[PDB]
Design an enzyme around this catalytic site. Sequence first.
Site, mmCIF file in Angstrom:
data_model
loop_
_atom_site.group_PDB
_atom_site.id
_atom_site.type_symbol
_atom_site.label_atom_id
_atom_site.label_comp_id
_atom_site.label_asym_id
_atom_site.label_seq_id
_atom_site.Cartn_x
_atom_site.Cartn_y
_atom_site.Cartn_z
ATOM 1 N N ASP A 1 -2.227 13.214 6.222
ATOM 2 C CA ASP A 1 -0.774 13.128 6.127
ATOM 3 C C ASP A 1 -0.141 13.102 7.509
ATOM 4 O O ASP A 1 0.750 12.298 7.757
ATOM 5 C CB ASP A 1 -0.217 14.287 5.294
ATOM 6 N N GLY B 1 3.246 4.095 -1.394
ATOM 7 C CA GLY B 1 3.727 4.604 -2.653
ATOM 8 C C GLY B 1 2.928 4.155 -3.857
ATOM 9 O O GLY B 1 3.076 4.770 -4.915
ATOM 10 N N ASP C 1 -4.305 5.608 2.479
ATOM 11 C CA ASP C 1 -5.021 5.478 1.210
ATOM 12 C C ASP C 1 -6.527 5.632 1.447
ATOM 13 O O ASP C 1 -7.216 6.337 0.710
ATOM 14 C CB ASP C 1 -4.767 4.126 0.541
ATOM 15 N N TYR D 1 0.762 -1.253 0.000
ATOM 16 C CA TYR D 1 0.000 0.000 0.000
ATOM 17 C C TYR D 1 0.789 1.298 0.000
ATOM 18 O O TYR D 1 0.213 2.359 -0.250
ATOM 19 C CB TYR D 1 -0.974 0.004 1.179
ATOM 20 N N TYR E 1 -0.966 22.353 1.738
ATOM 21 C CA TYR E 1 -1.530 22.794 3.010
ATOM 22 C C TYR E 1 -0.385 23.366 3.839
ATOM 23 O O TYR E 1 0.781 23.161 3.527
ATOM 24 C CB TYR E 1 -2.198 21.629 3.771
ATOM 25 N N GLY F 1 0.149 0.719 -4.349
ATOM 26 C CA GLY F 1 -0.962 -0.252 -4.428
ATOM 27 C C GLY F 1 -2.360 0.096 -3.899
ATOM 28 O O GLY F 1 -2.612 1.171 -3.338
ATOM 29 N N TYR G 1 -7.349 9.352 2.108
ATOM 30 C CA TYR G 1 -7.479 10.088 0.861
ATOM 31 C C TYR G 1 -8.773 9.685 0.140
ATOM 32 O O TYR G 1 -9.424 10.511 -0.509
ATOM 33 C CB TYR G 1 -6.286 9.811 -0.041
#
Lengths: 5, 121
Positions: free
Chosen positions: B89, B29, B48, B27, B64, B31, B51
């Site tokens: 983040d 970077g 992920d 997951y 931001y 997938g 987002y």
Amino acid sequence: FLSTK
Amino acid sequence: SLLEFGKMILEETGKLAIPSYSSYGCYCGWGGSGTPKDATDRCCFVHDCCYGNLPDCNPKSDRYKYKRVNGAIVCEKGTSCENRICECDKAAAICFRQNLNTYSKKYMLYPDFLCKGELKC
């Protein structure tokens, strides 16, 4: 300079 | 933005986002499938999903602002998308820091075929 999905 | 996230990651962990988390596990970077390989990969799974909670936002490019109170990350007020992206983040950077103890280089450049199946957010 791109790197993360 | 991706670049800001990468700087946040480096500040938090001491590791460069590329290559340390840009291709890690199933997951990080890249997938979107499989059982996450370890806690660090789970940070990316959740990031992920985070987002994914923001359809109409553009986390790769939208910038931001945040500051550090002592060591704490404080997201400063921007647009609603920026605020929500920042919180995603921030959480991931903290999660990476909390896991560093089990980070494994063997999961860098992890091949896609070893990541199968859907895992719901």
